[PDB]
């Protein structure tokens, strides 16, 4: 079973910089490049795999010249001269020389852009979730950088770190930022017992926390 | 001009068999060889095998006892059948053309003994306080559902830019997800904004209109 060892797993790169992915096979995949069936695909967030490079170095139709490909016996390198924002996604090597066809573990390519603060907005529980026994307080932290970020939840002043879920979107293929949603869930009865709900986002781009809140009632 | 479409159940119980279909459009299935591929969570593909121009089938050894392929020229579809599935068979299944330059959107399959639960989508609007700039953010919460996935759109797909759909989180064997869209302060609440949430597993479809708080 040809084992495709792909590295690095994560490749942080700045816009315009050179990017390189390496892939190694436990078996020879051929001896010519026109007999060596090692290819490169890219998988964008929420899309199917796109063939970018086949036969080691043959660039597929519609693929810019920034994408390069070379190799030998068991060693193969994939390069991206000028990394652009739309190159965001995971790169996979894959061979079809031997059965069964095997893939590389994949390489997640991320862009290193400039720091940006999050745009925070807080939302009270829906009028209909309440009539259904529960109460959820959502707060969005949109388009920031870097990815690392903390969210604090204060109920009438006191911190509530129990019952909070957070989720980050994939890097934006346009501004290269991250977005995050924070959800504090409670029962309707406890929700009604309090008035003020705060959402505090502290991020590298600031010493002071961005604070958004609302006064139930 | 070729199109591939995979379909099937998004939920199967351990020990039962999985049955997928790949609808091919733009060229008869008898023109060439077709591919079956699965992708387990954590970016890990595994070639499953292929159907030949003549209906022959090659199965990846790690599956040929549970796996089975077939085709139907009249419906221009070819199928995949996997017996005795375990939670390890949980993956997004794909069918691609011979040279792998055209894949289907893929169909995600969850092997779990949990039951199917439609989501409760709630409108997320500002409390007299999403504001007065030139941009306003509205949200939509999709809660307590199972299994994956769900597809969220804004204004039937018209609102595309400024839309952030966050990954679902699993808790209590139930999934929860949210989506926000930022639009100009003038188009809203002047014009209407609605989130279209659809859940395959339950064949559910909800359209919540984001109305300002009274």
């Amino acid at each position: 079973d040809v084992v495709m060892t792909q590295s690095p797993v994560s490749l942080p790169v700045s816009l315009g910089d050179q990017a390189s992915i390496s892939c190694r096979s436990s078996q020879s995949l051929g001896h010519s490049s026109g007999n060596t069936y090692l290819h490169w695909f890219l998988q964008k967030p929420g899309q199917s795999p796109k063939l970018l490079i086949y036969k080691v170095s043959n660039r597929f139709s519609g693929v810019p010249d920034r994408f390069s490909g070379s190799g030998s016996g068991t060693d193969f390198t994939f390069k991206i001269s000028r990394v652009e924002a739309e190159d965001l996604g995971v790169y996979f090597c894959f061979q079809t020389t031997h059965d069964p066809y095997t893939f590389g573990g994949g390489t997640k390519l991320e862009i290193k852009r400039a720091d940006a603060a999050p745009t925070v907005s807080i939302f009270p529980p829906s009028s209909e979730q309440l009539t259904s026994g529960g109460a959820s307080v959502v707060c969005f932290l949109n388009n920031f950088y870097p990815k690392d970020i903390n969210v604090k939840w204060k109920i009438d002043g006191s911190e509530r770190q129990n019952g909070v879920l957070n989720s980050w979107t994939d890097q934006d293929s346009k501004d290269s930022t991250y977005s995050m949603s924070s959800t504090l869930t409670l029962t309707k009865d406890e929700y009604e017992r309090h008035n003020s709900y705060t959402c505090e986002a502290t991020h590298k781009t600031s010493t002071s926390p961005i604070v958004k809140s609302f006064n139930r009632n | 001009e070729v199109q591939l479409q995979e379909s099937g159940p998004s939920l199967v119980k351990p020990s039962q068999t999985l049955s997928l279909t790949c609808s091919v459009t733009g060229v008869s299935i008898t023109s060439g060889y077709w591919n079956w591929i699965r992708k387990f969570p954590g970016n890990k593909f595994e070639y499953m095998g292929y159907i030949s121009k003549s209906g022959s089938a090659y199965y990846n050894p790690s599956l040929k006892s549970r796996i089975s392929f077939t085709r139907d020229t009249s419906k221009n579809q070819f199928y995949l059948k996997l017996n005795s599935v375990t939670t390890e068979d949980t993956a997004t299944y794909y069918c691609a053309i011979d040279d792998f330059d055209i894949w289907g959107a893929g169909t995600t399959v969850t092997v779990s003994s949990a039951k199917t639960t439609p989501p409760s989508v709630y409108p997320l609007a500002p409390g007299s306080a999403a504001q007065t700039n030139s941009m306003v953010t509205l949200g939509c919460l999709v809660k307590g559902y199972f299994p994956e996935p769900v597809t969220v759109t804004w204004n039937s797909g018209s609102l595309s830019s400024g839309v952030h759909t966050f990954p679902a989180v699993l808790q209590s064997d139930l999934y929860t997800l949210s989506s926000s869209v930022t639009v100009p302060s003038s188009p809203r609440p002047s014009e209407t904004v609605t989130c279209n949430v659809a859940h395959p597993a339950s064949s559910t479809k909800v359209d919540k209109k984001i109305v300002p708080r009274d």
């Binding site: 597929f60 | 060439g32 060889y33 011979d98 040279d99 792998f100 330059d101």
Partner: peptide, 10 residues
């Protein structure tokens, strides 16, 4: 079109 890397190479 046809690159020849698929399951039906012969």
């Amino acid at each position: 079109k046809r690159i020849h890397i698929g399951p039906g190479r012969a």
